[PDB]
Amino acid sequence: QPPPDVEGDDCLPAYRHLFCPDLLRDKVAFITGGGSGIGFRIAEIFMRHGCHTVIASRSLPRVLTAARKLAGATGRRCLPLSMDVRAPPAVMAAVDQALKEFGRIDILINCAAGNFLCPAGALSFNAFKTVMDIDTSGTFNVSRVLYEKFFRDHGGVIVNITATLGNRGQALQVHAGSAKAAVDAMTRHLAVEWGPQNIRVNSLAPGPISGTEGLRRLGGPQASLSTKVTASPLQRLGNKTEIAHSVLYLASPLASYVTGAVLVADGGAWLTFPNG
Amino acid sequence: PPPDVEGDDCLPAYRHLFCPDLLRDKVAFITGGGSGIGFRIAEIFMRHGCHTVIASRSLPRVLTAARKLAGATGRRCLPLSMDVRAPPAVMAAVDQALKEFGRIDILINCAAGNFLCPAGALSFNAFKTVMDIDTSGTFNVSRVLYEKFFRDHGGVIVNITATLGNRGQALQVHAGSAKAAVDAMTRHLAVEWGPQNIRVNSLAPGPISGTEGLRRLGGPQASLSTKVTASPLQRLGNKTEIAHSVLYLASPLASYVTGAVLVADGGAWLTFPN
Amino acid sequence: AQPPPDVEGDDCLPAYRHLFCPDLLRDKVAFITGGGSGIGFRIAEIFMRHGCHTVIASRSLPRVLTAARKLAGATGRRCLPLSMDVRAPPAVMAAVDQALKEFGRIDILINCAAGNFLCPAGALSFNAFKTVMDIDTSGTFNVSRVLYEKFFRDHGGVIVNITATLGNRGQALQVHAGSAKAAVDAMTRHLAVEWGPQNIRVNSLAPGPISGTEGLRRLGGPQASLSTKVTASPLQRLGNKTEIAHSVLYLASPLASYVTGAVLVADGGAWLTFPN
Amino acid sequence: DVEGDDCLPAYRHLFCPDLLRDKVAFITGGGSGIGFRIAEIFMRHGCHTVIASRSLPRVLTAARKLAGATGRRCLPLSMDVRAPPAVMAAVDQALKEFGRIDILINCAAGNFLCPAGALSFNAFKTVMDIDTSGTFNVSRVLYEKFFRDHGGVIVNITATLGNRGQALQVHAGSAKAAVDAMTRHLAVEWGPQNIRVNSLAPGPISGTEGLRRLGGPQASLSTKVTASPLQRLGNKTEIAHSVLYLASPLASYVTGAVLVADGGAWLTFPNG
Ligand SMILES: CC(C)(COP(=O)(O)OP(=O)(O)OC[C@H]1O[C@@H](n2cnc3c(N)ncnc32)[C@H](O)[C@@H]1OP(=O)(O)O)[C@@H](O)C(=O)NCCC(=O)NCCS
Ligand SMILES: CC(C)(COP(=O)(O)OP(=O)(O)OC[C@H]1O[C@@H](n2cnc3c(N)ncnc32)[C@H](O)[C@@H]1OP(=O)(O)O)[C@@H](O)C(=O)NCCC(=O)NCCS
Numbered sequence A: 001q002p003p004p005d006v007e008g009d010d011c012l013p014a015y016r017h018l019f020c021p022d023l024l025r026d027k028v029a030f031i032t033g034g035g036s037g038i039g040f041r042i043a044e045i046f047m048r049h050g051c052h053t054v055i056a057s058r059s060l061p062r063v064l065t066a067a068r069k070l071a072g073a074t075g076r077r078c079l080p081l082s083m084d085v086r087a088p089p090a091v092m093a094a095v096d097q098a099l100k101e102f103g104r105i106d107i108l109i110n111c112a113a114g115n116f117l118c119p120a121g122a123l124s125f126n127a128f129k130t131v132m133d134i135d136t137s138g139t140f141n142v143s144r145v146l147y148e149k150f151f152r153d154h155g156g157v158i159v160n161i162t163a164t165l166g167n168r169g170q171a172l173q174v175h176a177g178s179a180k181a182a183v184d185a186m187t188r189h190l191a192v193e194w195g196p197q198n199i200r201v202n203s204l205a206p207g208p209i210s211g212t213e214g215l216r217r218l219g220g221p222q223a224s225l226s227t228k229v230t231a232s233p234l235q236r237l238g239n240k241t242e243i244a245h246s247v248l249y250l251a252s253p254l255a256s257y258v259t260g261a262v263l264v265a266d267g268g269a270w271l272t273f274p275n276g
Numbered sequence B: 001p002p003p004d005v006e007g008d009d010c011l012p013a014y015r016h017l018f019c020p021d022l023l024r025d026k027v028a029f030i031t032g033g034g035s036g037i038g039f040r041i042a043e044i045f046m047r048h049g050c051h052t053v054i055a056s057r058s059l060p061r062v063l064t065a066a067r068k069l070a071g072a073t074g075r076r077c078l079p080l081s082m083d084v085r086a087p088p089a090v091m092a093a094v095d096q097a098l099k100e101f102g103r104i105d106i107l108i109n110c111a112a113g114n115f116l117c118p119a120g121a122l123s124f125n126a127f128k129t130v131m132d133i134d135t136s137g138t139f140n141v142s143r144v145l146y147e148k149f150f151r152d153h154g155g156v157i158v159n160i161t162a163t164l165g166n167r168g169q170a171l172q173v174h175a176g177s178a179k180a181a182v183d184a185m186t187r188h189l190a191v192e193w194g195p196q197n198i199r200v201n202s203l204a205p206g207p208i209s210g211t212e213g214l215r216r217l218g219g220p221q222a223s224l225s226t227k228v229t230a231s232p233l234q235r236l237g238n239k240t241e242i243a244h245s246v247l248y249l250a251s252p253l254a255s256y257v258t259g260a261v262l263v264a265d266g267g268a269w270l271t272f273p274n
Numbered sequence C: 001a002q003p004p005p006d007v008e009g010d011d012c013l014p015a016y017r018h019l020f021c022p023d024l025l026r027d028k029v030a031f032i033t034g035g036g037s038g039i040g041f042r043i044a045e046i047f048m049r050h051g052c053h054t055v056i057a058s059r060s061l062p063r064v065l066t067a068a069r070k071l072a073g074a075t076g077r078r079c080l081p082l083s084m085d086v087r088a089p090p091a092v093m094a095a096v097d098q099a100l101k102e103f104g105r106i107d108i109l110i111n112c113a114a115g116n117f118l119c120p121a122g123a124l125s126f127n128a129f130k131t132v133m134d135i136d137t138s139g140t141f142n143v144s145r146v147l148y149e150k151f152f153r154d155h156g157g158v159i160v161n162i163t164a165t166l167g168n169r170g171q172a173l174q175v176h177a178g179s180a181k182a183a184v185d186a187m188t189r190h191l192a193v194e195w196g197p198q199n200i201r202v203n204s205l206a207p208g209p210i211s212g213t214e215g216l217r218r219l220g221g222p223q224a225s226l227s228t229k230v231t232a233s234p235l236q237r238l239g240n241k242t243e244i245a246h247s248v249l250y251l252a253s254p255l256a257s258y259v260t261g262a263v264l265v266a267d268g269g270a271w272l273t274f275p276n
Numbered sequence D: 001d002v003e004g005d006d007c008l009p010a011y012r013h014l015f016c017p018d019l020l021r022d023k024v025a026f027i028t029g030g031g032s033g034i035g036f037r038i039a040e041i042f043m044r045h046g047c048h049t050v051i052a053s054r055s056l057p058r059v060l061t062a063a064r065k066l067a068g069a070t071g072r073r074c075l076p077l078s079m080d081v082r083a084p085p086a087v088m089a090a091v092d093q094a095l096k097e098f099g100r101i102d103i104l105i106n107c108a109a110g111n112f113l114c115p116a117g118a119l120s121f122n123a124f125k126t127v128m129d130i131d132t133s134g135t136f137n138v139s140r141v142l143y144e145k146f147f148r149d150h151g152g153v154i155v156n157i158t159a160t161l162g163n164r165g166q167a168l169q170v171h172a173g174s175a176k177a178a179v180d181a182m183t184r185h186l187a188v189e190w191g192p193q194n195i196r197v198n199s200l201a202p203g204p205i206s207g208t209e210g211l212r213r214l215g216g217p218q219a220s221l222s223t224k225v226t227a228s229p230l231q232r233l234g235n236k237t238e239i240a241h242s243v244l245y246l247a248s249p250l251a252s253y254v255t256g257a258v259l260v261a262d263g264g265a266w267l268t269f270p271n272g
């Protein structure tokens, strides 16, 4: 039986520490996409282990609402910021402020993505490139800004949130599959070039996770969903807290020797899911 | 190795190992077919009976190439100017091809852009441009050909990729990411399009002599010689060898191959320094 | 689009149209383990249709004597049948000596010998697992190693290992075969690196589900669900022996002069979509 | 960390000390190297252990040290992973002593440098028998004796050698690639019995027989280490942390995966 989760963008009402509560004490994590879904639960878990956060995505409203829930449930600081990962000046602006407020950033989680089901034949060039732009160029943009502004001189840890869609070429998902495959390759590249600056860089590829926009958009009809979930190895959907725990493992000193790796946390699902 | 020539010029002689009618009367649309690997793929194709359309941004480049290719092989070569990033231009090119030949049987996505640069010095726009050309560019040509012809008649796509992303090669985050995304795209399209009789595969070349790629990315000649003699086959590959493996994938001999990546790199990704 | 023709039994093709030049392997000699039945037999026939003489070697002397009569009957090239278990190195060494005595050289080794059956991992005995590792993995290494020491080390050569995609997603009922074939894939890379400097190319070909083979008969399952998964796979059909032999011939030939350490999958995209 | 097969003098917790409270882990190769440090770090989180390998004096010595440093129980047993009667006997003994086994760590292996043209048939086969057949045998025994009916968690310790076909290592590369494939097959078959199965692939780890054997001359090893992304060797405690992660409830949704914990070394290390 998995750790408890909540379907909405709300904090866990109770929690049991399996990592020590001081694992990230006084560190600061910058989380793109931290106002909703997996990125919000990542923020919440990090703050429950001593970490302050900065959460950044397009909607200033989404992150303000989130930052008050996070701060309230954990007593740590959460700086919300409006920032499109495709706009380098907005990215530079956000990182500058995070540093003005905190004086340091230790961890970057690239969680910002967009996705929707569309057959390749109906997918426009602009549609495909929009997904490449947010997922891949966005991840590069934020990483590259964090490197210049803080990590190159102080070291750091980056976790990229990816997917397994590209492994078997999942139908209706050429855009997301291609974009997140490029992010897994970028992880290797940055691990190589930035390791000498004491920067670790890894990916975490989640399976179908309950209580997320990604599952609502992409899961398909509930009866065919249940049937594929029941046929997957752990016979269930993952939850956001399980994903936040793997991300926390990778962003922490427990993972001090892990770099350039892709941890798949998907209950086995890519091995068995249908690709009709 | 089979012989090759360093320039974007035709082979002075060629020995057939495939039958000279392997692609008789087929039509191959080759992006980047005016130079480097793409020029040699066009030439080898035409020497197996195929007409070509070559397309890239520079009209002067494809015009001069097309005269060379027709002159050497006796088959037809249509040159077109088209940036793979511009759906109007790509649509216009595929129409022009269909108007000239009435069919396209094969698409070779060879157009790419690359250069050496540390990830920390690489600009936001430099990264995105490589993704736009290599990745979104490949998707754009593949989808325009699907809509205009391959959906209704079937077809074969060969994507020219790379091994850079396997080990995260230094100075290459842009190209390594873009070509890894092309390898996933290959699988996605193979699955979606297979039922329309379309095969889609990736061919990843190693370091190839006589190419802009190697000129830009090869590094100093002394350190290049050294990684080369320390790789499994002990030599650079040439363009003719790459054209043979592309021809294999594009031909009825690979009738059961789809969603695959064929690495043709003399074993180099296994031993090259990173 | 119409596949090249094939026949279901271990019999030669009635007609064949060349797509490779008929002198591609003019007067070369290929040693093919498992060349008496199934995929290995069709590989033998196709090679000999391109000028190559063959040695076909497996356990059952009756099987290879009958094959070799048929092969030589249909193509006008020579086929030496030998009885040899790949697990017994004195027998391999003697078979290879005998071939060198007959033909004076060997240019190509195709390692096609394998053992497979459906079995749940919880029912698979220790000896059953080991037996499949011993034939597929040790047996491949053994043959490759004898060929190296008897001829290829000094003369160069080309090796094609026939493998599978089962280990990619951990196909159920196939732990033995999937592990064994994943070892051979790794072995391909290892040997490509060590033996490249002796002018030896080593690649793997991984076939998908193939009509008119013992493999499909044993492992296909009932015809109705077999039909369903075939129809749901990207080319919507089973592969045939002739198509696999064409990919094997490609890799074994001078057209693949710069291909080594690679695994070419030739499965109609089956592993992307087949249920697990 | 500490070079020998000795316990750490001190240890600060990053996972809670009750993470594995009262669980039982059966660790093949638990008497030395990585296996010994895994047993120690598991015991520091509340776990009891069973350490099993061919040498009974090696595991007797290890067990007294592990118990002594941690106050948890460590049952040593002698068994060859290639002999299914012995594996069945050790597993029966662990069950008599403890009544349960929650976790299996398949750490036993044999390796040495040898060019492929010089490796004997028997030398190849031996490495395949220990790493591959051994790992299947222990997993399948544990499945039949306990995991099938009660669930459980397996961590296979593997390697990255097979990725680029590392020279001098055809045996070990092949064997470990087979065990990574087995990880996926068992994850799929046994997931519905509440069994998780993952691989952890370490890189070059200081204070181990692996590194003493396979590292080659010190000057050349220093060089490739400096040229690797984190510019240092891994230690045994870092590997035991990643193995603990996978073996714990923190990895409740991880199955069928390979975690590479090698400092990025396979990405840059020489080969040829
Ligand atoms: C499209 C998205 C990624 C980003 O939005 P955006 O930049 O505002 O993009 P727009 O809506 O302008 O759409 C851009 C292009 O994509 C196309 N597109 C967008 N959604 C699409 C869909 N569901 N199907 C097909 N085409 C689509 C648009 O039509 C437009 O293409 P065009 O110029 O040919 O018409 C949107 O899905 C989003 O913001 N998602 C965030 C939430 C999310 O995706 N969560 C799950 C992550 S797992
Ligand atoms: C850059 C290229 C890929 C694409 O051309 P383009 O679309 O006109 O792009 P631009 O010339 O506007 O350059 C795009 C960005 O990349 C950057 N860039 C180009 N060459 C660069 C180099 N060697 N190092 C770092 N950045 C570079 C530019 O400075 C610009 O960035 P900025 O906007 O931050 O100033 C060009 O190299 C090209 O056309 N190459 C084609 C042939 C080739 O590379 N063959 C090899 C394939 S192996």
Ligand SMILES: CC(C)(COP(=O)(O)OP(=O)(O)OC[C@H]1O[C@@H](n2cnc3c(N)ncnc32)[C@H](O)[C@@H]1OP(=O)(O)O)[C@@H](O)C(=O)NCCC(=O)NCCS
Binding pocket: C114, C115, C116, C117, C118, C119, C124, C125, C126, C127, C128, C129, C131, C132, C214, C215, C216, C218
């Ligand atoms: C078993 C095989 C792999 C090799 O034969 P062999 O070396 O004579 O081995 P045996 O007949 O002694 O069987 C060896 C072990 O595997 C077991 N075995 C054989 N077939 C089995 C099956 N279908 N299910 C479970 N176990 C099986 C035997 O019971 C024995 O184990 P045990 O000692 O615990 O009883 C046999 O299947 C074979 O000859 N295959 C060749 C043809 C083939 O497999 N073609 C398809 C490749 S796609």
Ligand SMILES: CC(C)(COP(=O)(O)OP(=O)(O)OC[C@H]1O[C@@H](n2cnc3c(N)ncnc32)[C@H](O)[C@@H]1OP(=O)(O)O)[C@@H](O)C(=O)NCCC(=O)NCCS
Binding pocket: D108, D109, D110, D111, D112, D113, D114, D119, D120, D121, D122, D123, D124, D126, D127, D130, D209, D210, D213
């Ligand atoms: C060989 C080993 C794996 C297993 O020992 P064992 O089963 O008693 O094996 P043996 O000593 O009987 O050796 C079996 C074969 O391997 C060969 N072999 C052993 N060491 C070898 C070496 N360094 N180089 C080449 N061949 C070797 C033997 O000669 C024999 O082949 P043969 O019949 O052709 O003579 C041994 O190295 C070992 O016990 N290792 C465990 C510790 C270890 O390897 N740790 C490192 C990290 S895994």
Ligand SMILES: NC(=O)c1ccc[n+]([C@@H]2O[C@H](COP(=O)([O-])OP(=O)(O)OC[C@H]3O[C@@H](n4cnc5c(N)ncnc54)[C@H](OP(=O)(O)O)[C@@H]3O)[C@@H](O)[C@H]2O)c1
Binding pocket: A032, A033, A034, A035, A036, A037, A038, A039, A056, A057, A058, A059, A060, A062, A083, A084, A085, A086, A110, A111, A112, A113, A114, A115, A134, A138, A161, A162, A163, A164, A205, A206, A207, A208, A209, A210, A212, A213, A214, A215
């Ligand atoms: N959910 C799943 O089952 C699943 C499976 C595999 C992978 N994932 C991955 O997990 C991550 C989170 O997904 P989720 O399902 O939790 O959905 P989500 O809640 O919609 O998260 C996506 C986040 O990205 C932000 N975002 C989108 N575009 C952006 C941009 N251009 N700039 C900055 N921020 C942007 C969104 O906020 P704004 O709209 O405010 O920008 C949103 O908060 C993604 O990386 C996704 O690919 C999810």
Ligand SMILES: NC(=O)c1ccc[n+]([C@@H]2O[C@H](COP(=O)([O-])OP(=O)(O)OC[C@H]3O[C@@H](n4cnc5c(N)ncnc54)[C@H](OP(=O)(O)O)[C@@H]3O)[C@@H](O)[C@H]2O)c1
Binding pocket: B031, B032, B033, B034, B035, B036, B037, B038, B055, B056, B057, B058, B059, B061, B082, B083, B084, B085, B109, B110, B111, B112, B113, B114, B133, B137, B160, B161, B162, B163, B204, B205, B206, B207, B208, B209, B211, B212, B213, B214
């Ligand atoms: N050479 C190597 O060693 C090597 C190794 C691995 C992979 N490759 C791959 O092989 C292919 C050929 O490389 P090469 O070295 O032969 O280099 P090249 O000669 O420069 O080929 C690139 C071609 O792409 C065209 N092109 C670039 N951007 C374009 C755009 N936006 N739209 C349309 N056409 C475009 C260029 O023509 P215009 O300028 O007229 O547009 C040129 O003909 C590339 O895909 C490369 O990634 C090469």
Ligand SMILES: NC(=O)c1ccc[n+]([C@@H]2O[C@H](COP(=O)([O-])OP(=O)(O)OC[C@H]3O[C@@H](n4cnc5c(N)ncnc54)[C@H](OP(=O)(O)O)[C@@H]3O)[C@@H](O)[C@H]2O)c1
Binding pocket: C033, C034, C035, C036, C037, C038, C039, C040, C057, C058, C059, C060, C061, C063, C084, C085, C086, C087, C111, C112, C113, C114, C115, C116, C135, C139, C162, C163, C164, C165, C206, C207, C208, C209, C210, C211, C213, C214, C215, C216
């Ligand atoms: N058919 C498929 O769909 C498929 C799919 C994926 C992979 N493959 C691979 O394709 C190859 C051939 O399979 P197939 O389906 O055509 O089956 P097959 O006809 O049964 O071929 C297996 C052959 O191996 C020989 N063999 C078995 N054990 C041997 C040993 N110890 N020593 C020497 N030779 C031995 C057998 O001959 P004796 O009985 O005379 O020894 C038999 O000719 C195998 O490598 C298989 O793994 C097939």
Ligand SMILES: NC(=O)c1ccc[n+]([C@@H]2O[C@H](COP(=O)([O-])OP(=O)(O)OC[C@H]3O[C@@H](n4cnc5c(N)ncnc54)[C@H](OP(=O)(O)O)[C@@H]3O)[C@@H](O)[C@H]2O)c1
Binding pocket: D028, D029, D030, D031, D032, D033, D034, D035, D052, D053, D054, D055, D056, D058, D079, D080, D081, D082, D106, D107, D108, D109, D110, D111, D130, D134, D157, D158, D159, D160, D201, D202, D203, D204, D205, D206, D208, D209, D210, D211
């Ligand atoms: N060290 C590295 O840098 C490195 C790198 C990648 C992977 N690894 C992996 O990490 C694990 C431990 O390696 P290590 O360096 O720590 O070496 P190690 O100390 O030699 O550990 C190997 C263990 O395997 C046991 N063993 C060997 N054969 C056995 C058999 N037939 N049955 C039962 N037990 C057996 C040995 O004990 P007995 O002699 O008492 O049997 C020994 O305790 C191995 O799986 C290795 O492949 C290590």
